[PDB]
């Protein structure tokens, strides 16, 4: 060996690994969307909406199967393989388009921006091509109905091709502007606080490792945090594409962050938050189980 077809066995594995970590996580992926996007949705009446994480797991079984908990998860398992793909195509050409040429350490701010720059264009980039996965996946998971006779969509090809030839790609792109955004809010907040933090602690290695594990994990949390509410306009505006009139709740990006703001309140925006700050320290918690030999 020394050219041994290496290089792909690890992009299988890692696609592997992905599908499993939110597939264990699905469930409470599922009541985190659904606490999320419910306010808006055509079935979930107000005398059915949830009170919250146990009363919507303790409830959905009931309602529409054991199973239904992984209501939308197919799109989570593909989505991986086609976006690393286009990683391997553009990630790098980013870096150094807008960090090539400066060093960290001799230009913090130079090199803050152009690093959300290089993630920001390299996420838009990504999205455009496989964000439709994540609007089945979202409208899917909201998808409150029982039989498929009470189902506005009967899996991810289906609500593809429907919302498609509902509105083309204009229904399957809402919320891309407001998410892409988001991306750069997440980026600024990961990276701003890793770098207050690198300092309040102990970087001579000194500090355990599984303490360096609940650390990353805290600023992955916080991180997700701040950009929340983008990803609630985000997915309410996903929740629209193919409702032609009437219940139209929104019609812009702005038009969401004002009618919740106001209906909802200066909190709704937040609404799952805490349910996702679980699904993520359980994902990656997953990936630690996971590396068995
Ligand atoms: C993958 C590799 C990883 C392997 C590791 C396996 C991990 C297991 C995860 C699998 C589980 C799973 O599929 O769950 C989804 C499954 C379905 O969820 P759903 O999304 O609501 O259903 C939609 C229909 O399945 C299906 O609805 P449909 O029939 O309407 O859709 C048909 C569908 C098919 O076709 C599409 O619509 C796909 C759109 C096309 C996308 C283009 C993709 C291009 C890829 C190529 C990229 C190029 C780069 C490569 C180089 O959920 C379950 O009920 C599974 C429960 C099992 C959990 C067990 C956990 C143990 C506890
Ligand atoms: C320090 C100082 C600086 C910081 C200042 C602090 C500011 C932070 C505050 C942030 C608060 C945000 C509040 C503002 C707000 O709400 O604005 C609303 C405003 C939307 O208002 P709206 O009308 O009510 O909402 C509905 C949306 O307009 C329309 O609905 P939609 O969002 O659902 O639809 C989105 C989509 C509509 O979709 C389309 O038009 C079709 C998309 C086709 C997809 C199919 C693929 C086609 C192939 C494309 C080629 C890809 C090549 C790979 O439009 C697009 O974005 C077009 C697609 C773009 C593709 C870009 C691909 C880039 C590739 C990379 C190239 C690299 C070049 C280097 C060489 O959002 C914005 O879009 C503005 C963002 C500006 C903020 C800038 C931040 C300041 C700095
Ligand atoms: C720390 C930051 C967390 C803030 C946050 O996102 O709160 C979520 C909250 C929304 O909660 P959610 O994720 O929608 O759903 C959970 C339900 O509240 C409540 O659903 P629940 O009643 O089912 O959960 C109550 C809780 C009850 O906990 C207990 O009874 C004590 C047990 C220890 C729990 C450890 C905490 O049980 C759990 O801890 C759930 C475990 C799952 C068991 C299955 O969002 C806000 O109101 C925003 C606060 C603003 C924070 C801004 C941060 C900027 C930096
Ligand atoms: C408005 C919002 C909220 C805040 C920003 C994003 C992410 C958290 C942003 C995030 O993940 C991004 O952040 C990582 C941390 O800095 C960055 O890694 S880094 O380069 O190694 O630093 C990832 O890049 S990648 O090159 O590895 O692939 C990048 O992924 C993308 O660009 C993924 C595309 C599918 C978009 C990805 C993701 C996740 O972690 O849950 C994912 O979909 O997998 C998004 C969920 C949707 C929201 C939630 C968007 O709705």
Redesign the pocket.
Known sequence: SDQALSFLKDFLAGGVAAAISKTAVAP?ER??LL??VQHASKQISAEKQY???????VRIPKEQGFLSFWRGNLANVIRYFPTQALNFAFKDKYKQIFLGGVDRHKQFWRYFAGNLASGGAAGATSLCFVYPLDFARTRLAADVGKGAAQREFTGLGNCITKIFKSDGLRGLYQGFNVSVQGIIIYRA?YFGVYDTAKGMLPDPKNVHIIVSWMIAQTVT??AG??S?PFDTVRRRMMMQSGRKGADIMYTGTVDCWRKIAKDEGP?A??????????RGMGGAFVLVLYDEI
């Open positions: 409470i009541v985190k606490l999320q009170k919250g994480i146990i009363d919507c797991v907040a949390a916080v945090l701040v929340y909190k925006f937040f609404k799952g938050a805490w349910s996702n700050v679980l």
